[PDB]
Design a protein around this ligand. Sequence first.
Ligand code: CLA
Ligand code: CLA
Ligand code: CLA
Ligand code: CLA
Ligand code: CLA
Ligand code: CLA
Ligand code: BCR
Ligand code: BCR
Ligand code: BCR
Ligand code: CA
Ligand code: CA
Ligand code: CL
Ligand code: FE2
Ligand code: MG
Lengths: 81, 65, 38, 34, 56, 39, 504, 342, 37, 167, 30
Amino acid sequence: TTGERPFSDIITSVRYWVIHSITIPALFIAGWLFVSTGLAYDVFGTPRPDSYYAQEQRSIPLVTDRFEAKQQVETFLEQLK
Amino acid sequence: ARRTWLGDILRPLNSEYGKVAPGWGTTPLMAVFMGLFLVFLLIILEIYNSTLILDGVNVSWKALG
Amino acid sequence: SEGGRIPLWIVATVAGMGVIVIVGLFFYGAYAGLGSSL
Amino acid sequence: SYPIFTVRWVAVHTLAVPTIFFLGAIAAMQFIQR
Amino acid sequence: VSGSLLYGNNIITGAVVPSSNAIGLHFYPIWEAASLDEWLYNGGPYQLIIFHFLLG
Amino acid sequence: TITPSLKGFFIGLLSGAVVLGLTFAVLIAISQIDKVQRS
Amino acid sequence: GLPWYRVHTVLINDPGRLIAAHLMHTALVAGWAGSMALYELATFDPSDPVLNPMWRQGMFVLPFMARLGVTGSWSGWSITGETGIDPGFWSFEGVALAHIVLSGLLFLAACWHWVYWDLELFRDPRTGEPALDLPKMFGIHLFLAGLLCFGFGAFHLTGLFGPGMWVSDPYGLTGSVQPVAPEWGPDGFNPYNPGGVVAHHIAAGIVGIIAGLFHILVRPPQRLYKALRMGNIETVLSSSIAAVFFAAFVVAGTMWYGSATTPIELFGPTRYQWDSSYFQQEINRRVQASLASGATLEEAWSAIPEKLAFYDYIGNNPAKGGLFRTGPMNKGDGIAQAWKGHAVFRNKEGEELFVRRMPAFFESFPVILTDKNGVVKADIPFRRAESKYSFEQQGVTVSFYGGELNGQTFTDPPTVKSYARKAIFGEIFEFDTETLNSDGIFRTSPRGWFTFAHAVFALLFFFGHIWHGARTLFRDVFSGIDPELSPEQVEWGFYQKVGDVTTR
Amino acid sequence: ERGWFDILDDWLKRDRFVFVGWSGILLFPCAYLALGGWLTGTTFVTSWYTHGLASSYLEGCNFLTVAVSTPANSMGHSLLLLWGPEAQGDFTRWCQLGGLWTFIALHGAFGLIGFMLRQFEIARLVGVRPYNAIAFSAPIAVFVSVFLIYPLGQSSWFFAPSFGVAAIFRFLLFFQGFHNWTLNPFHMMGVAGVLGGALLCAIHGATVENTLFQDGEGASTFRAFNPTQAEETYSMVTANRFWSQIFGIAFSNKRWLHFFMLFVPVTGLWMSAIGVVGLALNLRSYDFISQEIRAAEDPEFETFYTKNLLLNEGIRAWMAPQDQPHENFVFPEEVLPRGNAL
Amino acid sequence: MEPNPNRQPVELNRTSLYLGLLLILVLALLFSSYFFN
Amino acid sequence: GTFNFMIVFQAEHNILMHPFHQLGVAGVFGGALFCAMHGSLVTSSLIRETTETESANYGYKFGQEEETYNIVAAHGYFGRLIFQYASFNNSRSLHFFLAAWPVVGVWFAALGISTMAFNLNGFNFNHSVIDAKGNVINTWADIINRANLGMEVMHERNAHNFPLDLA
Amino acid sequence: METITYVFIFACIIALFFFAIFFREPPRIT
Ligand code: CLA
Ligand code: CLA
Ligand code: CLA
Ligand code: CLA
Ligand code: CLA
Ligand code: CLA
Ligand SMILES: CC1=C(/C=C/C(C)=C/C=C/C(C)=C/C=C/C=C(C)/C=C/C=C(C)/C=C/C2=C(C)CCCC2(C)C)C(C)(C)CCC1
Ligand SMILES: CC1=C(/C=C/C(C)=C/C=C/C(C)=C\C=C\C=C(C)\C=C\C=C(C)\C=C\C2=C(C)CCCC2(C)C)C(C)(C)CCC1
Ligand SMILES: CC1=C(/C=C/C(C)=C/C=C/C(C)=C\C=C\C=C(C)\C=C\C=C(C)\C=C\C2=C(C)CCCC2(C)C)C(C)(C)CCC1
Ligand SMILES: [Ca+2]
Ligand SMILES: [Ca+2]
Ligand SMILES: [Cl-]
Ligand SMILES: [Fe+2]
Ligand SMILES: [Mg+2]
């Protein structure tokens, strides 16, 4: 043994579960709201199901310039009206 | 072992086997040069890569003429 | 605080059921909403 | 008798905290409709 | 399909070619053919080889 | 002249120096606080 | 006895025979250089620098000789296409011969160091045992390397005392050996600026001199001496192998992407010049400038140099080859004889049509023609029964401007299709496929082969480095671990610090 | 000597549950960021702007189809640093441009270096020979060759494998259709080494497990072993006679057996690495010229090689327009290669 | 001349011979197709 | 011909997208990993019985009773490389794992082929992802699909008279 | 010539099998 508290002791202890019956569900709910509020989409720039294409467009918004790529993308996002 | 004229001339350049400077000696200075060299490779890399773009530095066959 | 209060076989059974539930939810989600092909 | 905050503890949580966050996120994702 | 060395294959391209689709799952031993020339045309070696192999 | 990308380069360099710096500082601190027992 | 893969280890403690072995090696490499150069001169046709330059002929060492200023033969020709030049002794032949003689002299020296291995020079005067003081050898060698680097940059490359180096226009049309002044500004780190190469060798040269003096005069720290086992020559082997694979990946990269030391007239064009249609853009620029100044279409295209059109042809793309497709590019598509001229496609309505070019990725590629806006107007169909775009339906025609076919128009679908098939490759050329029994399948250039070989060897030297670093650092345990190794040294918690007995 | 360095060394090399080491300083952040980047990307990040693909659970992908996809072809080989000239410090745009790909590839790489250094460090401290690290050189050669050298020889990071299950399958089929990669003898050696390593793993495990000495009364024989026992747990003599009579040859030397077990998969992976490096330059084993000359003159001449080339031609034409969107391929129905009916 | 003491005998046992011949022959069988091309 | 069989199989069954073949891959890749691993650790823990001018193999003599490496040291290494309880201290358990992993995996590969033999095929996520309008949003699965289509349409180019390949 | 070569190499391999089995160095317990 290397000196740290054994895992079976910790996770069979009451205190561990007092702490984690709070912290685990809290994290779970936080992830949930991260998606459900739509925040994930905004942070990562992932299209919502209605933001992949303009209404009549069938062409992929493929990035075609290395150094103006940011601008190209912004223009693509603008063209979603 | 065989001695030779040239062997006698070069003897001192190979007579200090095992000889060390005390402790860490010049290690920190070396370390500074390593940091600077790392930074240099990083610079020339990013120039070549066009991640670092410098005025008058046109990374292309069309560099001048 | 005291090690041993909540028996290890219960912790394992509950955690395991949790895993079954969450994975089960992901498999449900394969048939509904995005990625469902519908 | 035993320390609490060890290297092992940090390592465990660097993996475990985001894992639960992400599992929660994906769970939420199963209910998104086009 | 040419599978053999003498008929223009090297080690990488070469094969003993599978029996004819016309045979299907029919058992095609040498003696069911009117000739060895026929047996070879229809890929009897494949069947003889794979069955003896699998048994072995 | 300092182009936007040279500024970017400097930002990356600083970011790296910060990461490694805070890292070694913390590790040194911890090593000093938590010495091995000898003899 | 010794296992086979260890036979050379007898040299580890035999500096004289190790030196002998290095001499043999050096002799072998130099003999190779000589033999390769002679073979290349014996097969090389200097008659057409335009369409049959060295890089089409599988020349490998010839371009490196040219790169540093050897451009002529004693027989009177030059790789730039001049006649009646006297190159002096330092023709390609002179280089080869010099290398052969060097090789030989190194062989004899190898023999001397092998027989007379037991020189007092190689013995530690205090212990009488064989020993090499590697840190100081390093300093001496570093100093010499430095002097040589400096002198190379300052004298050879500047032309101050030397020929200079190969430099060219951006499109590899007018290359020659020129003196090059060092670039001391930021553009010196531009891979495409040669002056950067000169400044590099001069400055790095001085740095090598200084660091070398430093290494002659200043002993290693005890801590570094012990940590890197600097008394063990194998450590030097390990780190040297590491530096060498590093350098090899570097020359591989600059070969593949192109640089001022990897010029297209010596090694061929890059795959990327094809990717961005670099020569096509320049050709079009020149043609447009020609039309703008009042030239006819025919005149405008005839003014395009054949060499430039040849660079705009995928057969010269180094990314079109095959690993077992051996030899010169000429063995494949043939010896290029002439540009046919620019093929222009048109349909029955007279709209200009454009063939979709084959990307390097595709061994085969369909034939597709679009209008200037990329709308499909014609193709060579696979299934015909529902074809709507056949050249026959669309009455596709082709007219040639410039080259051998200048002014001609073909309207019969078979011929127009043939030229379209060739047009996917870009500009179309006449080839001699008979002389070499060319088989018609693209081969890579010396650029591709160099890049391949060096990337591979570099990658294997990564293993070499790993292996020898391990041997250096684990010398104590390479016949096996301590038979008296205590289980407590490996049982958890017994020591607070792994492997440290003083921490029970 | 007892300065801060040696004290730091002391703490770093403490015998704890998860060893850290000097190697840990490189390994752990880099491995953590690599893994984290992969999970983050696979959960939340699109490939719409780089590939015209969905690639996250958020978009409806599953574990099999999610990926962190390569950057757009137009990015070339940009390191694509967050603070680089493309993204200009904007994390969202950086995500949308595929910055996470280069993030994962490069941190992955420094991470593997950290792992191998770790193997070395621990080997030195424990007093074993560092063959585990040496064997680990093979995974690295594969990673470096496939994820770095390969795309660097091509047009851009775009054509590297994307970090995703399905993305990886696509990468395999691409290599078939374009490189005819199965035909490459370096790949064939890779295969032989993988299948050979698995064979040796299975056959040695089964052989040890079936020549055990009876060292306990239990019918479950696992307890009848003690880590510290001097004696061999299985009969080498019996194993040898068995295989000698069954297969014709057999091991008689355990040290050789195990070195061979090191040698085979490692050498295989390394060979494969060499082949893929070749593919970086399209220097393929695509064809046999003799085959082509014969088939071109003789339309009755057919081999499995020619059949596979037809397959290859199909893959290339049918997958290319969507797989390589930057080329703006439009292949009319009539040009698509097809056999009868299908 | 006074003999060199660094000399070592060299060995290849039979098992090693068989292994080497196997390696070389099978490699040749593999690559031969490509050499003939 | 083997490669042919493989390519056509991918076309007709999407074997790559079949979990049993993926299990086959974890199996053979894993088998190799563990083979190299075991090889390396055992080689790493050979007891010094030889000199540097001779092969370490001569340190083991055929049929000797004593083990030729130190498993406690091996375990000491590998247990620190990952963490203690992720390492085998039991040679019988370790070798059983070595037997079982590739064998079970390859059983699954074999069963993959054996079940795709009856046309229960790989996962089909073609057009699984759809936007708000109903536009198809390609995934990597769909690019795979395009490759499969190429394979499908070109193979046995003269064998089909009818539009579907039903066997 | 190709065919001759391939078959030659193969035959060399089978003969090698033969020698490797029946004419191996015998394993001896020390
Ligand atoms: C030691 C562990 C480690 C390592 C090896 C890396 C390595 C890498 N990371 Mg980093 N990363 C790490 C930890 C690490 N990371 C951590 C913990 C985080 C969380 C904050 C990140 C977050 C991160 C991000 C967000 C990103 C990276 C990226 C990068 C890459 C480029 C970094 C660079 O350009 O720095 C340059 C700086 C140095 C090399 C330091 C030089 C130090 C010298 C010796 C001292 C000189 C500095 C001097 C004092 C400054 C004076 C300047 C003055 C003149 C103005 C690189 C592959 C990028 C990437 O991968 O993009 C694809 C990227 O976007 N990393
Ligand atoms: C005696 C002097 C001499 C001269 C004048 C030449 C000249 C010539 N030889 Mg060379 N050659 C020589 C000796 C010489 N050789 C010897 C002794 C050998 C045997 C090893 C060879 C083997 C050789 C071969 C195999 C080949 C040549 C070739 C050539 C020609 C092109 C050279 C070139 O491309 O170099 C390139 C050299 C470098 C790029 C040197 C790199 C230096 C590294 C990076 C140094 C790193 C270590 C250093 C200590 C780092 C610190 C530096 C410090 C300053 C900071 C050229 C005509 C080529 C030729 O075309 O064949 C016909 C060719 O292929 N030579
Ligand atoms: C840096 C090394 C190098 C490079 C880049 C070149 C490049 C060039 N050579 Mg030169 N050549 C070289 C070294 C090199 N050569 C050497 C050392 C020799 C002396 C033998 C020659 C002799 C030579 C001749 C005689 C000729 C060339 C020609 C040419 C060109 C044709 C290339 C060719 O067809 O490749 C073919 C490459 C291959 C088929 C790849 C070989 C791969 C091997 C067989 C792999 C071996 C695998 C191994 C056994 C596996 C072990 C596994 C084990 C560890 C388990 C080409 C430009 C030709 C040319 O056109 O010149 C005018 C020409 O005729 N070369
Ligand atoms: C300058 C580079 C260099 C040097 C000086 C050495 C030197 C040494 N290494 Mg080597 N090594 C290197 C690079 C280098 N290595 C690299 C890059 C690798 C990775 C591929 C290795 C891998 C390696 C291993 C795995 C081993 C060594 C060992 C040895 C030692 C004995 C060599 C011997 O007896 O072989 C005798 C060799 C033969 C009798 C025939 C070899 C035939 C080769 C495989 C094929 C033909 C090669 C061809 C002639 C060379 C062309 C030149 C090439 C550069 C293109 C020796 C001290 C051995 C050792 O440590 O023993 C204690 C050992 O086990 N090395
Ligand atoms: C898998 C990779 C790997 C591994 C396992 C080793 C392992 C070994 N090497 Mg190293 N080595 C490597 C790669 C590797 N090397 C590379 C790529 C080089 C460059 C030439 C070297 C150069 C080298 C030398 C010169 C020496 C060693 C030595 C050694 C040994 C001692 C350990 C040490 O020195 O580490 C060295 C430390 C590292 C490899 C870690 C470097 C981490 C860097 C600094 C992070 C940089 C971050 C970067 C700036 C971010 C920007 C990225 C950019 C793309 C944007 C050991 C056997 C020594 C030896 O053999 O002694 C007997 C020795 O003298 N190695
Ligand atoms: C018998 C069938 C067969 C076999 C045995 C193989 C086996 C091989 N093929 Mg494959 N291949 C096949 C058929 C087959 N192939 C077919 C039919 C095709 C279609 C043409 C391909 C196409 C193909 C390609 C295109 C490639 C391969 C590759 C390889 C090799 C993969 C080696 C590997 O482990 O890399 C796995 C990766 C590594 C070892 C890198 C390091 C990995 C690190 C250590 C991972 C660390 C993970 C970390 C702990 C976190 C995990 C997090 C978790 C959440 C995931 C190997 C030789 C590759 C190869 O050749 O590489 C050189 C490759 O590029 N093959
Ligand atoms: C990138 C980013 C970075 C970093 C970040 C990070 C670091 C994060 C982390 C995070 C992570 C770390 C993630 C999480 C996770 C996991 C998940 C995502 C979930 C899961 C699980 C599972 C699902 C399981 C299941 C299965 C299997 C697998 C096993 C067993 C069986 C079963 C069925 C159970 C930063 C920010 C700096 C900046 C830039 C960006
Ligand atoms: C511990 C273990 C763990 C976990 C496990 C688990 C989590 C599992 C489970 C399960 C569970 C979760 C429990 C159970 C079972 C159930 C049953 C079996 C019952 C019975 C029922 C019936 C029989 C009845 C029916 C009837 C009729 C029929 C109709 C109507 C009415 C009724 C309903 C009544 C693990 C593995 C991780 C590890 C190891 C150990
Ligand atoms: C002695 C004497 C003499 C003579 C010298 C001579 C007669 C010359 C030589 C030398 C020689 C004339 C020889 C040589 C060189 C060559 C070699 C050394 C090469 C090698 C090759 C290699 C090594 C490669 C390998 C390869 C293969 C084959 C295939 C592919 C892959 C590779 C690349 C790997 C004199 C008068 C000077 C005077 C002094 C002394
Ligand atoms: Ca809706
Ligand atoms: Ca002919
Ligand atoms: Cl087929
Ligand atoms: Fe074993
Ligand atoms: Mg769903």
